[PDB]
Amino acid sequence: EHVILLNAQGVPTGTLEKYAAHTADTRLHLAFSSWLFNAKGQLLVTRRALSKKAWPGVWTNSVCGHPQLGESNEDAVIRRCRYELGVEITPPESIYPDFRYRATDPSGIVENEVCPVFAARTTSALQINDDEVMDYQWCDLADVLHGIDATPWAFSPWMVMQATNREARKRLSAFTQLKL
Amino acid sequence: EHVILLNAQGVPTGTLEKYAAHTADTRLHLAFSSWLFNAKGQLLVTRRALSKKAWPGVWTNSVCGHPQLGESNEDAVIRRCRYELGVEITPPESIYPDFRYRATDPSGIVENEVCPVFAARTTSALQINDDEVMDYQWCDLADVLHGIDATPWAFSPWMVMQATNREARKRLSAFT
Numbered sequence A: 001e002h003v004i005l006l007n008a009q010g011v012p013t014g015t016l017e018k019y020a021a022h023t024a025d026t027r028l029h030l031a032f033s034s035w036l037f038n039a040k041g042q043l044l045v046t047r048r049a050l051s052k053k054a055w056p057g058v059w060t061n062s063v064c065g066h067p068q069l070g071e072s073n074e075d076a077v078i079r080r081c082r083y084e085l086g087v088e089i090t091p092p093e094s095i096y097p098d099f100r101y102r103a104t105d106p107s108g109i110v111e112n113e114v115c116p117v118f119a120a121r122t123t124s125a126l127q128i129n130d131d132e133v134m135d136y137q138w139c140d141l142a143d144v145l146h147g148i149d150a151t152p153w154a155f156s157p158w159m160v161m162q163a164t165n166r167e168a169r170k171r172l173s174a175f176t177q178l179k180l
Numbered sequence B: 001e002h003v004i005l006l007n008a009q010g011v012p013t014g015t016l017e018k019y020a021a022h023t024a025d026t027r028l029h030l031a032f033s034s035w036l037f038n039a040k041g042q043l044l045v046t047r048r049a050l051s052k053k054a055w056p057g058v059w060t061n062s063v064c065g066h067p068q069l070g071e072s073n074e075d076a077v078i079r080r081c082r083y084e085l086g087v088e089i090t091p092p093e094s095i096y097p098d099f100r101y102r103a104t105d106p107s108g109i110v111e112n113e114v115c116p117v118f119a120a121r122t123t124s125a126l127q128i129n130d131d132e133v134m135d136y137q138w139c140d141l142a143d144v145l146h147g148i149d150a151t152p153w154a155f156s157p158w159m160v161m162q163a164t165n166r167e168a169r170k171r172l173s174a175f176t
C-alpha cells in the first residue's frame, strides 16, 4: 500500500509506501474518514487493533483509511469497509469535505492529513478483521456525542474533531433515522 | 509475584504466578481496585500499557492490583501506587468492600476476582512507570461519571461496574 502525498495547497505530488509514510515526521497526504450506521440508525464505533502503527487500542469512528493511486475517495471508503469490517454499505455521502488535521499519537507517530469525511449505511452483517479492529459497539449517536463531550481524551482526536463540527454533526444525526 | 486463589467461602487455597494466572480460563483470585484524587479533588484516570496481559490500552480507574500472601489490602494499594505511578498516598479508604467480578477482554483474557475497592489522595507528584501506564488524565469526577454513563464501553468493565454501584459512587463523590 502507499499514500498520496499532497503539497501545502493540498495538490497531489506523488505517492509513498504506507508504512514508511507514517513516522515522527509524516508529510501531508490524502486520507478518508467514515461514520457507519445500521438500518436501525445506530452508529458503529470501533477499537483499533493493538497492531496498528498509529493509535493502537484506541476507540474511534467506524473506518479510517488511505485512498490508493487511481482510486476515488468513495471507492476507498467501500474497500476499507470491506477490508476492516467485512461490510457492504450504501453510497458514501460527503459530510465534512474540507476536514484536515495533524496529530501525534501516544508513541510519537504523526498523522498529517487532508481527510474528507463521509457517512453511510451498512447493508450486510459485519465480518470484523481482527488484524485491524479489536473491538466494536453499536450505539446511539447522542450517547457517543455526550461521551465525547465529557471525556474527549478517551477517543481518537480525529473522531472528536469531526464530531464537533456543526454541519458534520447534523449529517450524522440524519443517519440515526430507522430505515427499512 | 503471585495471585491468591480463593474458594467459594473466599478462603485462600493457594497461589499462581501472576502472569501465568491470567488466561482464557482465569480462576477466582484476590485483587484490589483504587481511585486516586489529588489535593484539589481531581480524579486520576489512567490508560493501561499496551504490554499488559489483560485489557491492554484501556482507560480505567487509577490503580488496580493483586494483594500477596499475608499482605493487607491497604498495603497492596500503596505498593502498587508506588510501583505503577511512583506516587505516595494517604491511607486508603474503603469505597466498595464487596465488589467482585468476571469479564473477558478483546483477546479473550479473563479477569475473575474478588476485588474490594478503595479511594485515597496522592501526596506527591506522579512518576510514571511506562511498563504499566501508557497515558493518564487528571479530570473532574463529574465528567468521568458522565462518560462512564454515556459510553461505558470506552472504559474498563470493572471501572464501569464500580462507578455504577450506587453507594460506591456516593462515596467517590463525597470523597472530593
Ligand SMILES: *[C@@](C)(CO)CCOP(=O)(O)OP(=O)(O)O
Pocket (backbone or CB within 6 Å): A031, A032, A033, A054, A064, A065, A066, A080, A111, A113, A115, A158
Ligand atoms: C485516519 C484519519 C486515521 O489516521 C486515516 C488513517 O486510518 P488508518 O486506519 O490508520 O489507516 P489504514 O491503515 O490505511 O486503514
Ligand SMILES: *[C@@](C)(CO)CCOP(=O)(O)OP(=O)(O)O
Pocket (backbone or CB within 6 Å): B018, B031, B032, B033, B054, B063, B064, B065, B066, B080, B111, B113, B115, B158
Ligand atoms: C484489577 C481489577 C484488574 O482486573 C485487578 C488487577 O489489576 P492489574 O492492574 O491488572 O494487576 P497488576 O498487574 O498486578 O497491577
Ligand SMILES: [Mg+2]
Pocket (backbone or CB within 6 Å): A063, A064, A065, A080, A084
Ligand atoms: Mg483504517
Ligand SMILES: [Mg+2]
Pocket (backbone or CB within 6 Å): B063, B064, B065, B080, B084
Ligand atoms: Mg495494576
Ligand SMILES: [Mn+2]
Pocket (backbone or CB within 6 Å): A003, A022, A029, A031, A066, A111, A112, A113
Ligand atoms: Mn495517514
Ligand SMILES: [Mn+2]
Pocket (backbone or CB within 6 Å): B003, B022, B029, B031, B066, B111, B112, B113
Ligand atoms: Mn487478576
